[PDB]
Amino acid sequence: ERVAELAAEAVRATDKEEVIEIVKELAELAKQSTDSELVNFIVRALAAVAIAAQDKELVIYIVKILAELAKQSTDSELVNEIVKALAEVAKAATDKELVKYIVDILLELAKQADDATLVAKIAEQLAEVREEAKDKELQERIDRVLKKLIEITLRALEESLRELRRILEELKEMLERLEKNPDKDVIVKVLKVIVKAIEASVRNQQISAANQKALALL
Amino acid sequence: ERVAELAAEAVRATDKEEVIEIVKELAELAKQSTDSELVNFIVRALAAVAIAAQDKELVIYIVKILAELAKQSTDSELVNEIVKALAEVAKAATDKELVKYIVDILLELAKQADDATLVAKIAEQLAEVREEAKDKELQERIDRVLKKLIEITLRALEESLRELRRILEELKEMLERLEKNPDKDVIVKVLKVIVKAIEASVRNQQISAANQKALALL
Amino acid sequence: ERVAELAAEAVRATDKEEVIEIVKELAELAKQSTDSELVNFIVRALAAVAIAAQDKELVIYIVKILAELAKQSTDSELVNEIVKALAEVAKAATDKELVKYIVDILLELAKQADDATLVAKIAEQLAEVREEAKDKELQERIDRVLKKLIEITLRALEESLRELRRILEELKEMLERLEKNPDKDVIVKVLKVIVKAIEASVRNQQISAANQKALALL
């Protein structure tokens, strides 16, 4: 495909202006494209271009593009692979300020993400960066961001409990209606609220587990 | 009101004997008073008296009074505001031994508190003290108390699980009764136990989340 | 009994060859024995023999035997007491390499154990060893194993959530069957799945709590 040929042109890497032209329309092709498999191949190729080559302006522009794809995307599987791409670029970086900018980008991605499971995966990639990072001050900056991500999952767990106590209260009031009249219609109504309580409880335990994972990564 | 006029007399702070007379009947007015809003204004005013002025005997007596109000109180919202008052007095303290006594008081408040959510809020105020405390040995004493509070929430989470497994067993035995006879009365009985299981599960997840918060504060 | 007389022969401890003969058939008596109370007395006596006496070959053989009993045993209460026996031998050890071998054995016991609650108890005994161990490098090895045990409970919590989301989906599809026909038979079928969802939720909260305990032990 044209995307496959455009990836072959990036292998040459003759000039920075050439690469900038490629990564431009590679981002435009990734935008407004439904196939996530295609976007994932574009994401891995763009990350390889940023991992290789030189110039921070090229790497920053690739990082900005990858972040933009994650902001627009509603697929957590694609945003995760983008986060993994940003983590791999930071691991193979010779400038502390470059990884500082990438980590702060991943921090902003987690603030926007509604899924607490995604904040846990961002915290895992940030923990993997810190393991191989060496050099303190940089690692201490990672731990500061990791503690910010744990604060995100904590607030998300608080909202999930409040939603769980509210549905629980509706369940106690719907059970209050059942005591007065033991009709069939009141039973299936309590059954619906019980299912809604189970679903809200499962969601709360998923966000609870994502918080515990972020705690272990610290 | 007389409480408002008594707070104005404390603004003068001419003599320690004057202040002791004020904080005495301010504590007596707070005791046997139903309005928590009034007690909260008394608590904030007493904390401002302890934050200002001098002499540890005055501050210790104010701390003892605030602790006594929290022991008697059954309102977690009021006990929390009292804990926040004890934390603010400790943050603006020039004697390490004074904050050591205040922290050990907050530790004793958490041991008495039945609510694991309150132990988490006490751990948050203790964590806020340690952040601005500086000077090691003091911070290491805070972390020792913080680990004691985590042990409190762990034991509370164990009791909640045992209560959850017991209700679960009643649910499995009540479901065992339903298989024999699928009557209406046996259905609404299982429905009652399911609601009791949901309620016990929600309580267990609240105490679980309070434990995770105490873990993050460490 | 012969086991009680064999324990009396170990009190003498005249020769290493004598003790090796005793601990041999003490292990053979413990194997293929249904009474756990008897095995527990054999386990405590063998641990006292390893805690006392000398020679690592004797202690290693006793440790191997205790580990073998835990691998075969399906009783978590017995495996726990065996883990406590391995922890007590390591606490009263004058060779760092001996406790390193015992800790790595306890690590292998936790990998085999299906119960996440048992991995939490192994982590508690490993935490107790580190508290009294002194000498860094050894403690850092304990923390590395403790972080491995937390990874075990995390993966166990992930499997429990996936099992919980699957049963939840069956619950949502069984509730989908109830909307079409509000028969009695479809109600008791949803009631069965609700009970299975409650049971799976309780199991997930037990493994969740075991993970939080391992986090606090770190």
d(CA C175, CA C181): 10
Residue among C182, C187, C211 minimizing CB distance to A212: C211
Q: Kindly identify which residue of chain C lies nearest to residue A193, measuring between CA atoms.
A: C175
What are the angstrom distances between the C-alpha of A192 and each of A151, A189, C191, C200? 33, 5, 12, 19
Chain A residues touching residue C168 (CB < 8 angstroms): 198-199, 202
3-state secondary structure chain C: CHHHHHHHHHHHCCCHHHHHHHHHHHHHHHCCCCCHHHHHHHHHHHHHHHHCCCCHHHHHHHHHHHHHHHHHCCCHHHHHHHHHHHHHHHHCCCCHHHHHHHHHHHHHHHHHCCCHHHHHHHHHHHHHHHHHHCCCCHHHHHHHHHHHHHHHHHHHHHHHHHHHHHHHHHHHHHHHHHHHCCCHHHHHHHHHHHHHHHHHHHHHHHHHHHHHHHHHHC
User: C75 CA to chain A: closest CA distance, Å?
Assistant: 28
The residue extents of the domains of chain B are: 1-92, 156-217
Contact list, A171 vs chain B (CB under 8 Å) = 195, 198
CA distance B59 to chain C (A): 34
Residues 6+ away with beta carbon under 8 Å from B16:
B53, B54, B55, B58
Chain B residues whose beta carbon lies within 8 Å of the beta carbon of residue A212: 212
- Which chains neighbour C (Cβ–Cβ under 8 Å, 3 or more pairs)? A, B
Put simply, the chain A residues between 135 and 194 with a CB less than 8 A from any chain C CB are 184, 187-188, 191-192, 194
Fill in the DSSP letter of residue A136. Answer: T
**Subunits with 3+ C-beta pairs closer than 8 A to A:** B, C
CA angle at C181 for the pair C177 and C182, rounded to the nearest 5°: 100
Tokens coding A69 = 């794809």
* CB contact (8 A) between residue C205 and residue B161: yes
Pick the CATH number of C2-152 from 2.60.120, 3.40.190, 3.30.530, 1.25.40: 1.25.40
- What CA–CA distances, in Å, run from C151 to A132, C79, C147, C215, C218? 19, 21, 6, 10, 12
CB contacts, 8 Å: B208 with chain C: 205, 208-209, 212
- A178 DSSP 8-state letter: H
Shortest distance, CA B133 to any CA of chain C (angstroms): 23
Q: Which residue of C has its CA nearest to B205?
A: C205
Long-range contacts of B90-98 (CB under 8 A, 24+ apart): B90/B129, B91/B128, B91/B129, B91/B132, B91/B133, B92/B51, B95/B56, B96/B135, B96/B138, B98/B56, B98/B59, B98/B60
Separation in Å, CA of A211 to nearest CA in chain B: 8
Resolution (A): 3.2
Taking alpha carbons only, the member of A89, A90, A75, A63 closest to residue A38 is: A75
CA-to-CA distance for C98 and C90, rounded, in angstroms? 7
Is C164 in contact with C200 (CB distance < 8 Å)?
yes
Round to the nearest angstrom and report the end-to-end CA distance of chain C.
43
For residue A208, the chain C residues in CB contact (below 8 A) are 208
Q: Are A94 and A75 in contact (CB under 8 A)?
A: no
Q: Among the residues of chain A, which ranges form H helices?
A: 2-12, 16-30, 36-51, 56-72, 76-91, 96-112, 116-133, 138-180, 184-217
- Nearest residue on chain C to B215, alpha-carbon basis: C216
Contact C197 A198 (CB under 8 A): yes
Half-sphere exposure of A136 (CA within 13 A, CB side): 0
Interface membership of C197 toward B (CB under 8 Å): no
Residues of chain B neighbouring C195 (CB-CB closer than 8 A): 171-172, 175, 194
